[PDB]
Amino acid sequence: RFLKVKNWETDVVLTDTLHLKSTLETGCTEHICMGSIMLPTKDQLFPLAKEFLDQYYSSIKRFGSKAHMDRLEEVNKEIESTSTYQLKDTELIYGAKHAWRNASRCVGRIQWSKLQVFDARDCTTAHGMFNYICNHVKYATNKGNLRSAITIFPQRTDGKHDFRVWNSQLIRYAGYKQPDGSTLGDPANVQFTEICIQQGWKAPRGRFDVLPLLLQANGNDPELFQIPPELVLEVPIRHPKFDWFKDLGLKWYGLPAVSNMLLEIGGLEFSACPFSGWYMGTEIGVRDYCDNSRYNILEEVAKKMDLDMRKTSSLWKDQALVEINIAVLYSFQSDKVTIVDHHSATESFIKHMENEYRCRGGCPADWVWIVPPMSGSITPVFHQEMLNYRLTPSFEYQPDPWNTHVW
Amino acid sequence: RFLKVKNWETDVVLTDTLHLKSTLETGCTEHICMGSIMLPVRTKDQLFPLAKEFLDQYYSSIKRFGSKAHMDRLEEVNKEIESTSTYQLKDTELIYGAKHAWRNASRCVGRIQWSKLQVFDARDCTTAHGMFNYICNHVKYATNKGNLRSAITIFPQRTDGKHDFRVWNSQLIRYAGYKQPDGSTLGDPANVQFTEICIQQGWKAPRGRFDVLPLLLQANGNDPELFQIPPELVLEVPIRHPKFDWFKDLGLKWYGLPAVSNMLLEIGGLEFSACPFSGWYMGTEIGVRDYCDNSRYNILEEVAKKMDLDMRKTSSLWKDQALVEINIAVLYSFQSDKVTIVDHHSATESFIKHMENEYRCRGGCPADWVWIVPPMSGSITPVFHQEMLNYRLTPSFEYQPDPWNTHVWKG
Ligand code: HEM
Ligand code: HEM
Ligand SMILES: Cc1cc(N)nc(COC[C@H](N)[C@H](C)OCc2cc(C)cc(N)n2)c1
Ligand SMILES: Cc1cc(N)nc(COC[C@H](N)[C@H](C)OCc2cc(C)cc(N)n2)c1
Ligand SMILES: C[C@H](O)[C@H](O)[C@H]1CNc2nc(N)[nH]c(=O)c2N1
Ligand SMILES: C[C@H](O)[C@H](O)[C@H]1CNc2nc(N)[nH]c(=O)c2N1
Ligand SMILES: [Zn+2]
Secondary structure, three states, rough: OOOEEOOOOOEEEEEOHHHHHHOOOOOOOOOOOOOOOOOOOOHHHHHHHHHHHEEEEEEOOOOOHHHHHHHEEEEEEEEHHHHHOOOOOHHHHHHHHHHHHHOOOOOOOHHOOOOOOEOOOOOHHHHHHHHHHHHHOOOOHHHOOOEEEEEOOOOOOOOOOOEEEEEEEEOOOOEEEEOOOOEEOHHHHHHHHHHHHHOOOOOOOOOOEOOOOOEEOOOOOOOEEOOOOOHEEEEEOOEEEHHHHHOOOOOOOOEOEEEEEEEEEOEEEOOOOOOOOEHHHHHHHHHHHOOOOOOOHHHHHHOOOOOOOOOOOEEEEEEEHHHHHHHHHHHHHHOOOOOEHHHHHHHHHHHHHHHHHHHHHHOOHHHHOOOOOOHHHHHHHHOOOOOOOOOOEEEOOOOHHHHOOOO | OEEEEEEOOOOOEEEEHHHHHOOOOOOOOOOOOOOOOOOOOOOOOHHHHOOOOOHHHHHHHHHOOOOOOHHHHHHHHHHHHHOOOOOOOHHHHHHHHHHHHHHHHOOOOHHOOOOOOOOEEEEOOOHHHHHHHHHHHHHHHHHHOOOOOEEEEOOOOOOOOOOEEEOOOOOOOOOOOEEOOOOOOOEEEHHHHHHHHHHOOOOOOOOOOOOOEEEEEOOOOOOOEEOOOOOOOEEEEOOOEEEEEHHHOOEEEEEOOOOEEEOOOEEEEEOOOOOOOOOOEHHHHHHHHHHOOOOOOOOHHHHHHHHOOOOOOOOOOOOHHHHHHHHHHHHHHHHHOOOEEEEEHHHHHHHHHHHHHHHHHHOOOOHHHHOOOOOOOOOHHHHHHHHOEEOOOEEEEOOOHHHHHHHOOOO
């Protein structure tokens, strides 16, 4: 019931008690572990509200106070009357920060308390959503000195008037199937791109076309908007040693901004809550560039490097991977766009974990996601046992809206 | 129930039914996943169902399920248990059981090979000296002058828990480690405690960086005894790099034979506490873990120095650069000396083909992602992108506590 986690490099053991608060289910049972699986009414609402307000009033050292009791009373009144309730600004901010704090797959959580929260609950139309999003993009980008931010649109009501950003990230590149059989651009976004074209977007048909936003307000049919090009900061990728690297014509965007998740706070559901931070280099250099189903550039790079690609055991893939990732970091650093390398980020996370164990009694962490996709065991997180469990407030995956939307 | 796993690179989806046969626990619950936790005397009463479950699996595999031979064997085992409180496996059952414990080993990326395993039956062994002779023979057979062959040697099963056979070494071949008065370590820091035990027992330590440890062997619950493996049976590879001529001057070498000796083999409820088993290395085990863990030989700094990489900031990825070079060197050296080794690309590609085959013929393949994904270059191997289900099947290999923590010293 009280659980130990050990670091096998340092022998440090920490004791987790925070897990006993976990509410949601993991996918695992006593018979089967699903650790590597990617996707494993009134009566319901008051308990969820109470749990949340209890933790909130606890956090501000006012647990059991009249203000605590009065707010439970007020929210109770309101749920009974209106079947939902509204968060105070202070609660919305607390909840958003804690959703990030509780994100077990996020290595960047040392930063969790420094989150700029933009309250967009007064938003009513898609044009308004576009405005809020441009402002978030500009604020978070901050000319390359990136700042964490979330923009929170109105909460789900009866579920037929959902706000959604159809895009998976605020900034992403289009994907196009070719008569050729190949894929131009990002193969991850082929389907979403078709949706955009079918809804009107005139596609430039290039390798790095920033997609338009497809915004849904109040359960209405989603509409298209182009982010002002001048607010989308991009970085050309070059290498400090290989002058030929620039000729690959690679670039990436500076701002990672997840826009397809659902924020749950005290039982309320915010289906449009785009949030952004800054990149860890491997996300671009290892995954975006080298996944076989992504830009898949390993073969081209290795060739320009004159490596022996005859046998897997020459480690030509590994050599070219390291170089691509040196180039990503160097390109961002040279242009003064915030980025973190996987060594620095993971070292940060271990310090954050220790703070959380010391101050909170634990930290939910998914080792499968936290360990970087290259050089795993030379980062400290590889050797750190982690317990994964689900705490609320939380970010949750939700189905793509085009499967849900009645047009 | 059917469970699906998806490959996120290929979109190939597999359906697992094998998990229905899982009995042992995982450590996980609906409320907590313990997937990254390293570590998450039987009654007659508990033993017969375990024996029956095993014999049913065995007789099905030979297409004799429910035959007179199957029924007579159940009968024979049942009477043996009620009368002696235990039972003996037939040689065929022992072979089948040892192979299946490997097939079932969810942390093992090398399982495409599971059906090719030489089983050495050492259940007539009675003394530590006897155990030494069996282990030498295993080493020589498995080594095969560099053309490595998988093998397991199986010593007598547990009886009352007071007469256990144990190999105290964690691997048959491993290098000594010595803590110095100034707090530095000579040799392998992983083996300091065991080295101190060997010394205490009377081993004369060479006190160098790659001293092969003696065997410490316990027969029949007696105090363990020291033996030196004949040096001519211990095949080693000096490590050099194909392009960097200074790499040899780091003085590195490693042994060719990875042989785990501290695990417990469970077959049909019987417990084989000494069951050393060996295969061949995947290069990253040596190049990444043994050489580059901070807690092991920790050579990253020296290598990067000699490569003249920019070491003033981690973001030059100097560690990653040195890491790849070291792993090239390991593969190169083993290949050059004709000692079997596999790279992490080949091994993971073979594991995926193995796993798909297992899904088709067997209904599943329990696999532990945390262990199967190599410790470098994870996502450029296909296993990174493969969803896996981890569950426990028997026969199995299990962790057991180090014997110095439990042994009753006779004196
Ligand atoms: C400030 C810098 C940040 C860094 C360096 C960072 C790092 C990361 C990384 C590397 C991932 C894995 C992404 C992947 O492989 O797809 C991740 C996942 C995630 N992070 Fe962050 N993070 C940051 C900020 C944030 C912020 C501001 C939030 C929310 C307010 C957040 C919530 C999440 C969530 C929910 C996931 C899991 C996403 C999913 O399941 O797809 N992170 N983080
Ligand atoms: C034939 C070549 C083989 C290869 C390339 C191979 C590969 C591996 C590797 C890389 C590991 C993880 C090692 C670590 O990080 O500590 C491993 C684990 C394991 N393999 Fe193998 N394997 C082979 C043969 C065998 C054999 C012959 C057996 C038993 C009969 C076996 C049973 C296991 C077990 C039980 C584990 C988990 C060990 C633990 O928990 O410490 N494997 N395999
Ligand atoms: C906020 C933030 C900062 C940072 N450095 N990196 C990120 C990474 O965002 C990318 C997303 N996690 C990607 C697109 O999600 C992958 C994914 C796929 C699926 C099927 C489910 C799921 N939960 N997640 C987000
Ligand atoms: C037979 C074989 C072949 C091959 N290529 N590799 C292996 C694995 O050898 C390494 C061992 N697993 C290492 C020493 O065990 C580490 C370990 C430590 C702890 C505390 C628990 C545990 N289960 N395992 C075994
Ligand atoms: C099947 C497996 O869960 C899947 O490939 C995961 C593994 N770890 C990951 N880790 C991160 N950070 N991001 C990912 O997309 C994935 N993919
Ligand atoms: C804490 C974590 O489970 C531990 O470091 C694991 C991770 N994965 C591993 N994978 C393999 N193959 N071998 C290991 O020793 C480990 N160590
Ligand atoms: Zn689990």
